[PDB]
Symmetry: C11
Subunit: 184 residues, 11 copies
């Protein structure tokens, strides 16, 4: 099942080796923080892809244990919303890590959009912070000032392009159906 599989020696060794490696400059992006300066981070979908290639689509899971709206205030016609989220990630052997993430909206004149942005940022930040605990290869390096300083002294390479000639254009997946029919 899930939560009852135990990693083989080979898979455990491979994952433990892979999780020590640091993220290249391809995975890091920057933001200009309000009142602060350049803050580096890893986008959410990139962390999801890293988790999917590390553990497999069936090797990790995550849930929201609780999400609480901290405050919704109205000042000078603008909405200030702050929302909290607790996200828990589990592996296929039963290993788990749970963390908190926070979502903020300080702008918009519409309450619904503010709450939406806050809640979604909350769950995403919680997922990322909870995945950090498994190792460097999942975002535990963006907190190290050494790796951060060594990134900035590296050439600012252009963002890569995506090729769209072998993309998925039909719903049917012959190999998947053949395997599934043979698995029954």
């Amino acid at each position: 099942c899930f939560g009852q599989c135990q990693y083989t020696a080979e898979e455990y060794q491979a994952i433990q080796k892979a999780l020590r490696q640091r993220l290249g400059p391809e995975y890091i992006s920057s933001r200009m923080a309000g009142g602060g300066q350049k803050v580096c981070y890893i986008e959410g979908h990139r962390v999801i892809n890293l988790a999917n290639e590390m553990f497999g689509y069936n090797g990790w899971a995550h849930s929201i244990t609780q999400q609480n709206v901290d405050f919704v205030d109205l000042n000078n016609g603008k909405f200030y919303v702050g929302v909290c989220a607790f996200v828990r990630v589990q592996l296929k052997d039963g290993s788990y890590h749970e963390d908190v993430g926070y979502g903020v909206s300080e702008g918009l004149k519409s309450k619904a959009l503010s709450l939406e942005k806050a809640r979604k940022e909350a769950v995403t930040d919680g997922l990322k912070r909870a995945l950090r605990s498994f190792g460097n290869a999942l975002g535990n390096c963006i907190l190290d000032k050494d790796y951060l300083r060594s990134l900035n002294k590296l050439p600012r390479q252009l963002p890569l392009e995506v090729d769209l000639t072998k993309a998925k254009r039909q719903d049917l997946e012959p190999s998947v159906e053949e395997a599934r029919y043979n698995s029954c």
Copy 2:
């Protein structure tokens, strides 16, 4: 059962390969935001079909853990409604992903219709966001801005017209019944 089946090697390999692929332009649609620019997304029925072809009609499940109506306000005769939803998707081995979706209604003059639109859009958004977590093939690519600007530089293809000559026209399904009678 469900939740205690385990993927064989062939099926796991197949699904892992198939989930890395990116969606073609057939699946992407666009909107004009409320004060923003072109926002790209995937329709809900499209991601439901993609899930049914990836994991099978018996391979995945999803539930609404919680749904809270954040607010229903009345301003200048018009209703503003914001509703939250937590959706959890599960696979047949026990893997799961839970995310949050938000439904908003802005202009309508009827409280019932606004609440309806909110409650429904909430669950749809939650399902889509929870299915994103399995890989690009289920909507994790629509967030990659590189992928997006790679799509926008392709021609705007025509709307496809679907064949309705072999559509289902009777309730009875001889193959399904003949197969079921032999399972008892």
Copy 3:
């Protein structure tokens, strides 16, 4: 038993093929919206029959996990009622889908009738929406605009007349009884 049977290869393959098919013009009905235009839908009993021929009378189940009366307002002597329902459909292997439905009553002058219409429409809409998630053959086509356009380009066929020469006219069922006596 239920929840712990697993589909054989033949039945799984048959159902997966049967669910991809689209519905013909016979299953679609139309409404004139309150300010909008032609909205296409599938009547509830039709979806129940489709589910009964897809999975069998014993292959699927459904429950109302929650039903909440959102509002009952009175304006100018007339009642406006809005009710929500959460419906969960489950297959005989443990595969489930849960969705929200909404029932509205706007004009009626009796409160009890309004609540009746609201609650019943809520349960039926929830059932239909939860059945959509199993495939096109259960009502996932009525969201595709391509399918709708291709439907509007077909002739407007006649409503068929049902035959009642072999209808049920006695309570006793000899075959069911002789089969059941041998099951003990």
Copy 4:
């Protein structure tokens, strides 16, 4: 045991055949709805008898998961009561269907009689609507407008007179007790 028995092939085939048939004009009855025209339905005991012949006295069960009184109002000395009921039906393999029923009382000058009528009608309506979902043989025909039209073009047969010459006239059931004593 109930809930853990599984239908044999013969019994499943027989029941699935017997549930597709439509009800004759015998079972249908009419009402003049408040302000509305002829409404067709099936009396509750008829549906109970049909369920007992289809599945057996031990093949089906039903319970009330919830019953709440929506409102009890007083206007011009007359009472208006609305009651809701959730009824869940189950078979001997685990297959269940749960629906909602509503009872209304807008006449009588006595509160007790009004509440009584409302609650009893609620449970009966819930049972009927839950039994609809198994097939046409249990009342899923009443919604088809084609079947309702085709019924009215049949002759009007006067209700048959039931024979009371072999009715039960003593409590002892010799065959039943002989079988029971042999089953110990």
Copy 5:
């Protein structure tokens, strides 16, 4: 035990035959309803005896899931009481049926006696309406208008005079005691 004993073929056949039969005129009694005309019914103890002889003293059981005092009102010095009861009957294989009964008290000048009558009549009505669902032989026939009309078309027999020449006159029961001693 109880709830885990499945009927053998002979007992099931016998009970299913015995439950279809209609009650004779010796079981039906009549009241003059308030405003309404003659209302026919079956006394409670008669239904209990019918159930004891259909299924055996150990083949059926019944519980009160909930009893709610709807209202107790005081008008012109007299008490008006209405009470609800939910009664659930279960057989020795797990088959169950749950129904609602209502107790009314209108005229009495003492609150305690009114509440007594209500609470007791509620449970009796619930038990009867629950046992109806097993078949005609337990009171599902008193609702058919055909059977009611055919009853009034029969001669009226004076109540039988019961024989007391072999009534129980000492507590000790030799047969039961010797069987019990041998059962240990």
Copy 6:
């Protein structure tokens, strides 16, 4: 254990025969109801003795699932108390019957004595009414008007005398002690 012994054929047959027997005039006693006339009943300890001799001291059990004090009123210096109880009787195979009893106290001038009488009479009435459901031999006869009218047609026999020459005079009991010692 209890709730897990199944009656052997001999004991079942014996008890089923014994429960059909009506009670003699020795058991019935009479009261004069307030505002009414002669009401016949069976005293509580007699019903306890009948149950002990039918099923054995280890054959039945009973619990009080609920007891609610309906009201305690003070009028003209006197106390009017009404109390309800729910008693559940269970046999050694798992068969159970649950019923409601009601206790009243109208005249007394001390609150404690009134509540005491109410509670105790409530539990006793509930026990009797729950034991009725097992058959005639446990009090299902006192409701039949035929049996009651037939009882008055019998002579008024003298009150019996109780022999006290073999009464228990010391606590030690050799037979049960030797039997118990041989049981370990």
Copy 7:
């Protein structure tokens, strides 16, 4: 364990015989009730001893399910306390009986002493009344008027003098210790 040992034939026969025996005049006492006359009863310790000799020190248990203080009132400087109790007795095969006892104090000028007397008398009365249900030998005789009037027709015997020449004088028990050492 306790609660799962089943009586052997010898012990069951012995106990069923021994419980039918009525109590001698040794066990009965007398009180002069306030507002009434001579009431007969059995002291609590006598019933505890009777239970210890009937079933053995390990053959019965009793618990207090609920105890409510019905009222504590103060009138002209004196305290009036009424307290309820629910006591449940259980044998070593799972057979149980539950009863309600009531304690009263209509006297004392101290609240603590009143509450103490009420609570203790409530538990004792509940235990006695719950032990009545096992048979005559445990107090089901004091309710029969025949047995009472047959007792008052007996000579009043002198108070017995207890022998204290072999009373327990040292704590250690050689036989019990030597028995326990051989069990381990």
Copy 8:
């Protein structure tokens, strides 16, 4: 373990014999009750010692299921406190007895000391009353007025002086340690 060890024949016989014996004058002490006369009782530690020598140090347990502070009131500067306690004793086979004790403090000008006295005396009284129900050898004699009269007519013996020559003077226990080491 504890709660699942059934007594052997020898131990059961021995304990049953030992529990019938009455307690000598060594164990009884007297008090001058407030307003009342001489009241006899057994000190708590003596009852604990008796229970330890009867059932062994590992043969009995006791719990405090509830303890409610009934009242804490202040009059003329002095505190009156009444506290209740529900205590449950259990033997090593599963046999249990639960009773009520009450602690009273009607003197001291300090609230904490009065509450302490009340609570501790309450638990002690509950334990003594619960151990009474096992037999005379544990305090069921102090309620028999015959035994009390027989005690008061014995010579008032002197307080025994305890020998302290073999008292425990070092914590280590050679025999217990050797046995425990050999247990592993």
Copy 9:
């Protein structure tokens, strides 16, 4: 594990002998009561050591089932705090004893220190009183007035000095780690 290890004969005999012994003068200490005289007691760490060497470090356990702060009052600038605790001790075979402890503070001008002293003293007193019930060797002697009299008539020994030349001076415990490594 714990609570599932029965004592062997040797260990049970050893502990039962050891628990009967009384404590010497080396364990008793004295206090001057608040308005009384010499009160004798045993310090907490002493009973902890006695329990450790009686039952072993892995042979007994204790929990605080409930701690309730009874009162915190401020009078004339000083704090009066009274706190209750319920302590439960359990041996390795499942035997347990639960008692109440009380902590008092009628002094200090600081609220935090008062509550601290109260809570800690409460838990310690509860532990000591709970350990009393296992026998004399754990503090069931400080309640016997005969033993207290016999203590004071024995010479007062001056406090012993503690050898501190083999005290623990490094964390490492070679024998413990050798055994722990061999235990894997």
Copy 10:
């Protein structure tokens, strides 16, 4: 799986040796406390890496059992927020340690940011303090004054620069996918 493995002798010995080692100056950082002096600590990602390399990515888990916002105050236009967190770490054999952490914000003029900082710092501090309890190698040495004084008398080495020539630059990881495919 997790929570149910047991360390082999070799792994247990290795970890017990590794946990006693003290951390070098590489891991320690310093802060200037408000009004205080230099405080030494270990950053969060460092202790996460230490735990990942001690026990493995699958050998430890941590959860947030509770997080409560102690206070959110607004003084002179600035926000002061204090939040608590309870973090529980668990090893793969079932060993666990739970400890409290606290997050503080005393500055910022934005409420959402202050709550964010408080919550995140709280969870991190709790995780660190819970990991301390496993030994010095996880941050139990930063509390020793001797070790801290020995650190400051050691040369201050320049911050190590991180090399990025072998950093992870692609999502796919051939080794782990091959091992996982062989693990099915």
Copy 11:
């Protein structure tokens, strides 16, 4: 697992011997209490190290059952905080001990820092007090006044200087990794 691993004989003997040893002066530390004198204690990390080396890093666990903020008062611009904690320690065979600890803060002008100090000190005090109960080697001797007097009669040795030439200076642990790879 953990909680079900019984100690072998050798390890039990070793730990029991080692837990009796009193701690040396190298472990004791001193404070100057407010209003009092020299108080002796053991720093928290010392007790954690002693527990790690007695039982192993996997031999003991601890949890916070409850933490309650007793009071947060503000007097003359300074904060007075008192908090409670219940800490439960458990060994690997199921043996547990639970004790209360208290945290005080009567200084600082900042509420956040006060609550922080209080809560952390409370958890640490609870852990120390709960570990005391296992023996002297974990801080029980710190309460014996004889040992405290004997400490001051011993030369005041200077605190040791810690060696940092074998400190951990890289995260990777070869021995642990080899063992873990061979344990899969």
